[PDB]
Amino acid sequence: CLCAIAGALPPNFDPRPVETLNVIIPEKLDSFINKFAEYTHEKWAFDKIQNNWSYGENVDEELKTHPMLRPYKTFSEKDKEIYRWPIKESLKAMIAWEWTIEKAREGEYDPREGYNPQPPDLSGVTLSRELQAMAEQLAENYHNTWGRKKKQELEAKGGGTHPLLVPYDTLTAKEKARDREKAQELLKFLQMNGYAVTRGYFLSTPAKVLGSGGHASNKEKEMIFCKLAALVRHRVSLFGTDAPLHILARSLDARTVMKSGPEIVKAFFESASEDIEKMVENLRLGKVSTTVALLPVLTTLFQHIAQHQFLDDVQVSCYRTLCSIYSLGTTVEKLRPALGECLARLAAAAFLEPQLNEYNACSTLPMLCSYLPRWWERGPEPALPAGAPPPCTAVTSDHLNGNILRIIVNNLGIDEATWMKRLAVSRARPELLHSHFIPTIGKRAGKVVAEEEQLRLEAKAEAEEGELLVRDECRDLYALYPLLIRYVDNNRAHWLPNANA
Incomplete structure (x- = not known):
């Protein structure tokens, strides 16, 4: 908290x-x-x-x-x-x-x-x-x-x-x-x-580099009592990260260093969660703007190879560095091709969060062609493969940054496929994350058929309220249906065009 205070000061x-x-x-x-x-x-x-x-x-x-x-x-x-x-x-x-x-x-x-x-x-x-x-x-x-x-x-x-x-x-x-x-x-x-x-002042930053040196002492711990204090110090690094110029980029490199020394453990657990907040500090490292940081991707590729064998926390940290890639969306290329290799590692086949990490990693015509093939897969609607395709969908949303609008209308047709899937769970919540991608993806005639899906919501509400009439003389089965229908209502939030109405 004192660190938060001094960081506030930096702004007998x-x-x-x-x-x-x-x-x-x-x-x-x-x-x-x-x-x-x-x-x-x-x-x-x-x-x-x-x-x-x-x-x-x-x-x-x-x-x-x-x-x-x-x-x-x-x-x-x-x-x-x-x-x-x-x-x-x-x-x-x-x-x-x-x-x-x-x-x-x-x-x-x-x-x-x-x-x-x-x-x-x-x-x-x-x-x-x-x-x-x-x-x-x-x-x-x-x-x-x-x-x-x-x-x-x-x-x-x-x-x-x-x-x-x-x-x-x-x-x-x-x-x-x-x-x-x-x-x-x-x-x-x-x-x-x-x-x-x-x-x-800048002294806080140079002292942060001193913390990077004590982090090299933590690498000496990686060679294996002070280390718990180093963990609380990492928590201080997180709270200081909440407070967050070239020296600051040097600090970003230090963040890459601590991310790497943590990455050695990537392949007690609350300190690993502190390594996740430290991954958010790595997002702050992305915020700063030598090539050694690209080496972190190189471990990610081999880790991706481990995915071929089918631990997961390394994939989650990769999802967080992918959130830093979303910061790049708010903002070496061969290492991006290595990210394409990891994308192939996910393409070979729970890991859907890492798939979304790949969708972040999207931030070259062959990508458009394989995406068209992914639309062909969208035509097919086993749904878990579509959950893997959601990464291709958000990556397609990245591709818009034209024809991608009409392709997005086809994605709305895929949402109608999600509606037919929704006619009667957690994978449907992943489909809700895909609905967030639809929020990114946001024509009315497709929303007219989607309105017919709302008529399906009317039939569902009718059968459910009638089941409540049975309750008057169970409803939880209708409750989850009401929840997925609520996710479809989030898709209606994407539909919010009211001026045209």
Whole structure:
């Protein structure tokens, strides 16, 4: 669910300060420290100028005076160290992370009584998001450092807790700002100096590729406890698939990879159903738009050869990849000829869902001729062979993408054959799937004879209601007839031409 949330975004404390005091800054950077300390005391005097503060004998807030308000040149270097200390500890903390801080780009309201700094405007500098992460993590350093000192201190005092004694990610954004702003000046002053400063979303997708690597670890499992977690991770891949550009195509290739490693098991079971949802993720892989994916078809051909022998789950996954072929209808060719080979494997002879998969696979005049022969077979109306022919019917619907309209009227005559078949079960439900193909196939005079089949529905309703009159003094046999007749009513939904009426 958290993955769904981040995917929606894509559209006794234990402080860890880095070691600081042990680290050694190069001495030439200390001259830079002179600069940041200079601006530090100058701007600090400047905010005091904002409130009309001035130098005086002693520390007296009510007197509008403060002794430290004296020029930076007046400081002894050791007094400068009092402001250098956060600077040196910060830069040493960065060198412990070995963040680069090096020479590069060229270096650079009534006035009040007393010392008068005229500061460069550091606060206006624009940190880059990588550098914003750097300031975020240095502020995280102030957080963990002054916070670790605060925890060891309060625990030394026998005290309880403080609001800031928290992991840095916890913070409300303005609390992040409380040290982020001090770091900003730390890094904003760096960028204003123009010095190179480095650690030395799409991240969800790259992490998905990392999931593909952990999936290679799952291939290591295919070599055969973590693997169940890999299965829940596959479920996460499904829910992430529900959330679903070239890197995304790379992810599609990863989907082909996981589909293949799953395909090794193709020839507990709920994880195989997760492999089916993973096949839907393969449909998402079809959505993305190297040739290794075509190899998946090559296993499909030999699996098709297994069909000649007459397990089934591999054929179902092939039906799902065929649904991805329907996505191609919403959208290597020799591998399509291999799909024609599997079509021959179905042509040799329950597997009707795989037949529909072939109808999806349809998405060259010889195909039209064999389809005409299939119409000749349609003339014959053992019905299970027609159920196999339903794939040829939907493939014929694919062929329309003319004469195929009148051929579709002949298909309506085949539906009349289905009506004669319907005069008195689950194969009839497969015929209802064929009726969905008729919905794809959607002349009135054929629907007039079909209306005569509706008259057969009237005779059937009459005999059935009369059977209910027998019930007044069993009906379930008439119920299934009412259901197939309801499928014929779905064919009437295909007939919905009302404007012509």
